[PDB]
Design a protein around this ligand. Structure first.
Ligand code: PC1
Ligand code: 3PE
Ligand code: 3PE
Ligand code: SF4
Ligand code: SF4
Ligand code: SF4
Lengths: 90, 68, 178, 155, 380, 308, 143
């Protein structure tokens, strides 16, 4: 109930301020950026549960899989780099 | 000189100190002179509900002890 | 004689020492902390600011500000209507019209200056052979209408009577340079 | 009486509008180096509340500094129109007051007061930053001497 | 092609045709500050016209008076005296310092570094104080005139100039620490607006835009006009033709200016200040008020000024922005028949389009700053 | 009592932003060899109220080709997020004690792109849309490291909670370790907040909306510096002295917020292309490398932290 | 050397007419410096000096609260400074009136007037030359 109260309060305050305000008187580069950001945000999604995965017993396995993730992500980055995907010189 | 920005720095510092100590004092006031018990898992919630049920006044922070 | 900027006397050394120095410069952000230090030093100095209406900026006895039509100790005017000021004024800002006065003298009936045409060059007081028109020291005479800056004989004579206690002293100071 | 509180309200509104003056510096020519020198330490434009230079879309005052030509008048008028009321104008220099040293030219507007309405005229070619500051404080007082709510009340 | 109009809303109007973030076409627009100086001058004596040059390229104003003075003296076939020449050199160098402060700091301002502006405009105030102490006006001192100089220096000016020259070096160093080796400055400037020497020549460039590409052309070491032949100073040349090289050149120029000022002060000679030819330069006021001939000459000079034998000249001055020239045509009259002003910013803007090839929208604002574009000398 | 706590939290942070404006102006002035505001009130403490009155008293020239919906809900959203971020912060005890609190911070920070983009799509032009696209791309790109840094530093404390970092730094700051992760975190806070040298979006709104945007900006500034203080500069926590913790937290947050302005006055701007190269070629490689390093550290060391 | 600074500060504070004068000064002229009183002018203004401050702040003025019928407690102008003190305050001199007095001449204004850009006693221009062309007036009786 408390979170609801706080957010409602903030919204009310914002709308009140903005009411008083009135009542007183194509390039593919950006698309490629968005796509790269998708492919890294999903990696964040696959990477966030490490604070719970590092509590397990299969440490030799979590080590492995996390290294796989990071390594192949770096390789994809390097390839997008070599292929001039981070240049901006139209 | 450089010692004329303090009239504002100190204002902001006081405004940034108020939240913390205010919240602490209000917690100590609403929860019987004790911190607000946290519940990261169900075990602590069970302990809390149990204290509340044994209180007899429906409040988890009314510790009873041996006398009861 | 010439010099070189952005040219080295000879190639450098790729030694591990210099390479590591440059890598430290890059990673540790070394050349920027010095700018931060310059800004901190300036924070810890005295600013050159002044309370304006209470503390005024320094000027010289040659400052060219507002205009004035002067007089003699007797009180008689000085302008003899010779029109050299009107003839030298680059912006054609001085309009003059004269006549013989009932006492038989060369004196003006009309002397108008347009401050929206004056470029404040002093040629008029350089030309006046009698020291009658002077670009005085005052600079604080802004207005709210474009019609208060069209001066005339009366306004200029009032300014002279007003500021003579200062114009005379500044002229006493500087007249040996001109 | 309501008159007392209305006077106080107008005084407060004017205090704010005169202590938060933001200029659009329409700087065209050699009457702009002086505005820069006025922002500089010795005069510290920013010390009275007058920001150095803001956007023409959230500004309050507009400083016309230098010769305005017939190729530049429409842009100045468009800026004046885009600006939000209540807006004030300050003409800095002979060029903008009456054309000055080019008043008899074919490509000069003989006064910014023909393209936009002016509130404070500063004379000089160029006027010292001290004089420009004097003029801006004169504008401050012109604002402090307004009676908007009073005239709306006794209407 | 994502076209846009940029600059106005301070008289510049660029029309930019982009391709994505790159810049393909830069069309500058001119005449937003065209007043008609060259035509008005035709209706004014050879002295009623001097202020116009103070008003052109309004950051120096005295390297502008100086060109007109030299041209009219070349026509009259006179020469001013040593003290006038030395004062004129000294103050020309001071105007150089002012202009270069202006350039570097407005460059860093339009780029984003703004504290040098305030650190250095105080020095600019202190030098406007000299301007005023000698002429009575902070900026537009109609002080240098054909025949020499209007007035002599007051008795407490050289000492002040010495106190100022003492510390301007430490100020330049204060700025250099922040700017020259900063990786962000170097990234904004290096390899920007490159231009080769032959193309510069064929485009009509002058000054730092020449000697930042390895060329050796300074109109004070070559084609000298004042006693500059009696004073020593170095000319900094570049190696790559980029904004960084030009920045360093302007800085070292601000330094050579102090090197020249030390010498000018130490070697200031005594004597008169304006040619003692009262048919050109007015007489003193005591002589005017006691002698007949002097008064007649004053009258004629301030009503129907001095007459100039017909001819034509092109006198070039090494102004802070480059070769400032005056094609001055004369009839045997008190007034000129034509005065054409050659300004470097003209050709520099003309070449902006080629200098902005293979560059973004945020590099053009620096390419401009590297030319010191003032529109008074351009639009005239 | 809870509403009173909410007031005690909200009012002071707004006051602190309003006065951080003045502190910025004064500091920049004294670094530029001038004073700054001195007049309106003693040392200027009335100038922010004056400016607020002025703005809110202006007349809004709402673009005609626009959409009122996206015109009003953009600054509303900005301020709502900028205020709801301050909620979970342990100072030392939090108003709302959340687990996954730093994740709530990440999300409620990443949600501002919507406003910074709707404003542009609303303003009917192409230059404003260009600027909005570029700013969105910048913010987006730097969110990546803003997330990975925390993902790697939250393995010295095995929990996404902010009330665990206190005991994690009960003996030593998390700066000595991960000072290379901070230097990359301290900057993504500038680029995320479009703060110089990353102000390529403010270097087109009425009085009220501009004011709300300003408030959001400076609130986010204070909050990012507060997060830095709590994470990498863990202050003192003696169970009986929340007063001490709050004092130290305030001091460090003010240090950081003054450092931001130090920087604004000290350095030039960047060029969008170079700004993006910075991340995608210097920060992401090092970030992933140090992420692997910090995944291995708690293993080849027996110092793997707990889950309480 | 910090306690000496604090002592200089406390004396700068108490160096006025107690709290009332301190507030008056600090709120009209945002400055609480102490200086030597070189003189005072007919209109109630005071002029202070201190040669150890830097050039531009080594001289200053406290204006009058009333000038020719006007509440100048808040409104204040550099136009209030009469000429003799204007010349010493803008540092054209090293000598003030008290020691170097002006030349006593009639037709010089005894009472100084400040800027009147909008007051009812302001300046309105006009032509000072008489009529040039005189017309013909016929008599007031016919034929
Ligand atoms: C979030 C808050 C948003 C709102 C903003 C909060 C407002 C803050 C209050 C600021 C007031 C400052 C007053 C000015 C001041 O400091 O004095 C110095 C000013 C000085 O300003 P000055 O313009 O004369 O210049 C000072 C002189 N120099 C510059 C040389 C230093 O004193 C005055 O001149 C007169 C003040 C006039 C304004 C006074 C306001 C009247 C009181 C308001 C009450 C209105 C409500 C009554 C009706 C009730 C309804 C039923
Ligand atoms: C156990 C042994 C092994 C363990 C593994 C770890 C070993 C240590 C690894 C070293 C880590 C190095 C530090 C990590 C960050 C480095 C990032 C970096 O170097 O950025 C490079 C970039 C410039 O790159 P570039 O353009 O190529 O250089 C010019 C070429 N001549 O530079 C930039 O562009 C940066 C731009 C900065 C602009 C803003 C600067 C503001 C600085 C303010 C001060 C901040 C101080 C930190 C604050 C902390 C916050 C609490
Ligand atoms: C017109 C203008 C429009 C602009 C509006 C912008 C509003 C955006 C405001 C920011 C959004 C905040 C997002 C809130 C997510 C909450 C996430 C969270 O952590 O809450 C979980 C909470 C605690 O759970 P946990 O931490 O896991 O463990 C607790 C055990 N002790 O357990 C809970 O689940 C608590 C109950 C959930 C409360 C969430 C309510 C969030 C605020 C609602 C906003 C409503 C706005 C209007 C409707 C939106 C449009 C439809
Ligand atoms: S100072 Fe003004 S009025 Fe006098 S000659 Fe020059 S332009 Fe004309
Ligand atoms: S030059 Fe002097 S005397 Fe001659 S008309 Fe002009 S003001 Fe009068
Ligand atoms: S009035 Fe004089 S200084 Fe001002 S812009 Fe015009 S010519 Fe330049």
């Amino acid at each position: 109930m408390n979170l609801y109260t706080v957010i409602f309060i903030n919204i009310l305050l914002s709308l009140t301020l903005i009411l008083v305000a009135f009542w007183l008187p194509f390039s593919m580069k950006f698309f490629l950026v968005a796509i790269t950001f998708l492919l890294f945000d999903l990696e964040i999604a696959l990477l966030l549960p490490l604070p719970w995965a590092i509590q397990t017993i299969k440490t030799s396995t979590m080590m492995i899989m996390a290294f796989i993730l990071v390594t192949i992500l770096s390789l994809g980055l390097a390839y997008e780099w070599t292929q001039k995907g981070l240049e901006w010189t139209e | 000189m450089w010692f004329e920005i303090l009239p504002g720095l100190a204002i902001m510092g006081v405004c940034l100190v108020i939240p913390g100590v205010s919240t602490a004092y209000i917690h100590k006031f609403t929860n019987g002179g004790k911190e607000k018990r946290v519940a990261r898992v169900q075990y602590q919630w069970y302990l809390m509900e149990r204290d509340r049920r044994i209180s007899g006044v429906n409040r988890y922070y009314v510790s009873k002890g041996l006398e009861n | 004689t010439y010099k070189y900027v952005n040219k080295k006397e000879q190639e450098s050394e790729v030694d591990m020492k210099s390479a590591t120095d440059n890598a430290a410069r890059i990673l540790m952000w070394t050349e920027l902390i010095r700018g931060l230090g310059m800004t901190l030093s300036y924070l810890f100095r005295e600013p050159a600011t002044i309370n304006y209406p209470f503390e005024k900026g320094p000027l010289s006895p040659r400052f060219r500000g507002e205009h004035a039509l002067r007089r003699y100790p007797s009180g008689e005017e000085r302008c003899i209507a010779c029109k050299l000021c009107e003839a030298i004024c680059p912006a054609q800002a001085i309009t003059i019209e004269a006549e013989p006065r009932a006492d038989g003298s060369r004196r003006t009936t009309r002397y108008d200056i347009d401050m929206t045409k004056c470029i404040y060059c002093g040629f008029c007081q350089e030309a006046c052979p009698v020291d009658a028109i002077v670009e005085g020291p005052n600079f604080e005479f802004s207005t709210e209408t474009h019609e208060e800056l069209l001066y005339n004989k009366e306004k200029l004579l009032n300014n002279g009577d007003k500021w003579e206690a200062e114009i005379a002293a500044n002229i006493q100071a500087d007249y040996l340079y001109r | 009486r309501a008159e007392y509180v209305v006077t106080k309200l107008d005084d407060l509104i004017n205090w704010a509008r005169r202590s938060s003056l933001w200029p659009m510096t329409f700087g065209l020519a050699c009457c702009a180096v002086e505005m820069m020198h006025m922002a500089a330490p010795r005069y510290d434009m920013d010390r009275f509340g007058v920001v150095f230079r803001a956007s023409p879309r959230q500004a309050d005052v507009m400083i016309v500094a230098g010769t305005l030509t017939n190729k530049m008048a429409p842009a100045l008028r468009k800026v004046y129109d885009q600006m939000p009321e209540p807006r004030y104008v300050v003409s800095m220099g002979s060029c903008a007051n009456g054309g000055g040293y080019y008043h008899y030219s074919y490509s000069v507007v003989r006064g910014c007061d023909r393209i936009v309405p002016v509130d404070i005229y500063v004379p000089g070619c160029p006027p010292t930053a001290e004089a420009l500051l004097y003029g801006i404080l004169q504008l401050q007082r012109k604002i402090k001497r307004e009676q908007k709510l009073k005239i709306w009340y006794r209407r | 092609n994502m076209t846009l109009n940029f600059g106005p809303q301070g008289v510049l109007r660029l029309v930019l045709e982009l391709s994505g973030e790159m810049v393909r076409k830069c069309d500058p627009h001119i005449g937003l500050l065209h007043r008609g100086t060259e035509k008005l001058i035709e209706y004014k004596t050879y002295l009623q016209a001097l202020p116009y040059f103070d008003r052109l390229d309004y950051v120096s104003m005295m390297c502008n008076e100086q060109a007109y003075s030299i041209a009219v003296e070349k026509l009259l076939n006179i020469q001013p005296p040593p003290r006038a020449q030395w004062i004129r050199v000294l103050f020309g160098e001071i105007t150089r310092i002012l202009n270069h402060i202006m350039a570097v700091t407005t460059h860093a301002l339009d780029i984003g570094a703004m504290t040098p502006f305030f650190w250095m405009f105080e020095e600019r105030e202190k030098m406007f104080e000299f301007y005023e102490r000698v002429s009575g006006a902070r900026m537009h001192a109609a002080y240098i005139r054909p025949g020499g100089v209007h007035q002599d220096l007051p008795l407490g000016l050289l000492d002040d100039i010495y106190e100022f020259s003492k510390n301007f070096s430490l100020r330049i160093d204060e700025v250099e620490e922040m700017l020259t080796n900063n990786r962000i400055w170097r990234n904004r400037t290096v390899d920007i607006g490159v231009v080769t020497a032959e193309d510069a020549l064929n485009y009509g460039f002058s000054g730092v835009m020449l000697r930042g590409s390895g060329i050796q052309w300074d109109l004070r070491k070559t084609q000298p006009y004042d006693v500059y032949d009696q004073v020593e100073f170095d000319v900094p040349i570049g190696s790559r033709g980029d904004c960084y090289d030009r920045y360093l050149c302007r800085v070292e120029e601000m330094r050579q200016s102090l090197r020249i000022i030390e010498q000018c002060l130490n070697k200031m000679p005594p004597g008169e200040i304006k040619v003692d030819d009262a048919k050109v330069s007015p007489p003193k006021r005591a002589e005017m008020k006691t002698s007949m001939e002097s008064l007649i000459h004053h009258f004629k000079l301030y009503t129907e000024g001095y007459q100039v034998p017909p001819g034509a000249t092109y006198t070039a001055i090494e102004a802070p922005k480059g070769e400032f020239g005056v094609y001055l045509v004369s009839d045997g009259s008190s007034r000129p028949y034509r005065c054409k002003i050659k300004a470097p910013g003209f050709a520099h803007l003309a070449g902006l389009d080629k200098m902005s090839k293979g560059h973004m929208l945020a590099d053009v604002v620096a390419i401009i700053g590297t030319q010191d574009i003032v529109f008074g000398e351009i639009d005239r | 009592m809870f509403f009173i706590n909410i007031l005690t939290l909200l009012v002071p942070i707004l006051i602190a932003m309003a006065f951080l404006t003045l502190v910025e102006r004064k500091i920049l002035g004294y670094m530029q060899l001038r004073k700054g505001p001195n007049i309106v009130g003693p040392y200027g403490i009335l100038q922010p109220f004056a400016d607020a009155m002025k703005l809110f008293m202006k007349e809004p020239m709402r673009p005609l080709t626009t959409s009122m919906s996206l015109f009003i809900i953009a600054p509303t959203l900005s301020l709502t997020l900028a205020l709801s971020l301050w909620v979970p912060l342990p100072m030392p005890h939090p108003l709302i004690n959340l687990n996954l609190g730093i994740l709530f911070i990440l999300a409620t920070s990443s949600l501002s792109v919507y406003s910074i983009l709707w404003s542009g799509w609303a303003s009917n032009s192409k230059y404003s849309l260009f600027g909005a696209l570029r700013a969105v791309a910048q913010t987006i790109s730097y969110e990546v490291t803003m997330a990975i840094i925390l993902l790697s530093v939250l393995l010295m404390n095995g929990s996404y909670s902010l009330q665990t970092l206190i005991t994690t730094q009960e003996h030593m700051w998390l700066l000595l370790p991960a000072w290379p992760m901070a230097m990359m975190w301290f900057i993504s806070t500038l680029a995320e907040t479009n703060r110089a040298p990353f102000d390529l979006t403010e270097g087109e709104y009425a009085a009220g909306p501009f004011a709300l945007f300003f408030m959001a900006e400076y609130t986010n500034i204070i909050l990012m510096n507060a997060l830095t203080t709590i994470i990498f500069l863990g202050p003192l926590y003696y169970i009986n002295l929340p007063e001490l913790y709050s004092t130290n937290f305030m001091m460090e947050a003010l240090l950081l917020s003054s450092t931001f302005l130090w920087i604004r006055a000290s350095y030039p701007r960047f060029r969008y292309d170079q700004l993006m190269h910075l991340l995608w070629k210097n920060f992401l490689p090092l970030t992933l490398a140090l992420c692997m390093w910090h995944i291995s550290l708690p293993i080849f060391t027996a110092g793997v932290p707990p889950y309480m | 050397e910090l306690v000496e600074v604090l002592k200089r500060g406390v004396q700068q504070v108490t160096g006025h007419g107690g709290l009332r004068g301190l507030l008056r000064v600090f709120f009209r002229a945002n400055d609480i410096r102490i200086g030597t009183l070189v003189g005072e002018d007919k209109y109630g203004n005071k002029y202070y000096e201190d040669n150890k401050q830097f050039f531009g702040r080594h001289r200053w003025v406290i204006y009058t609260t009333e000038m020719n019928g006007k509440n100048t407690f808040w409104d204040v102008d550099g136009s209030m400074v009469p000429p003799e003190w204007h010349r010493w305050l803008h540092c054209m001199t090293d000598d003030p009136p008290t020691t170097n007095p002006p030349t006593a001449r009639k037709f010089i204004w005894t009472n100084h007037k400040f800027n009147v850009s909008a007051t009812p006693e302001q300046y309105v221009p006009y032509s000072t030359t008489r009529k040039k062309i005189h017309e013909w007036v016929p008599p007031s009786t016919p034929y």
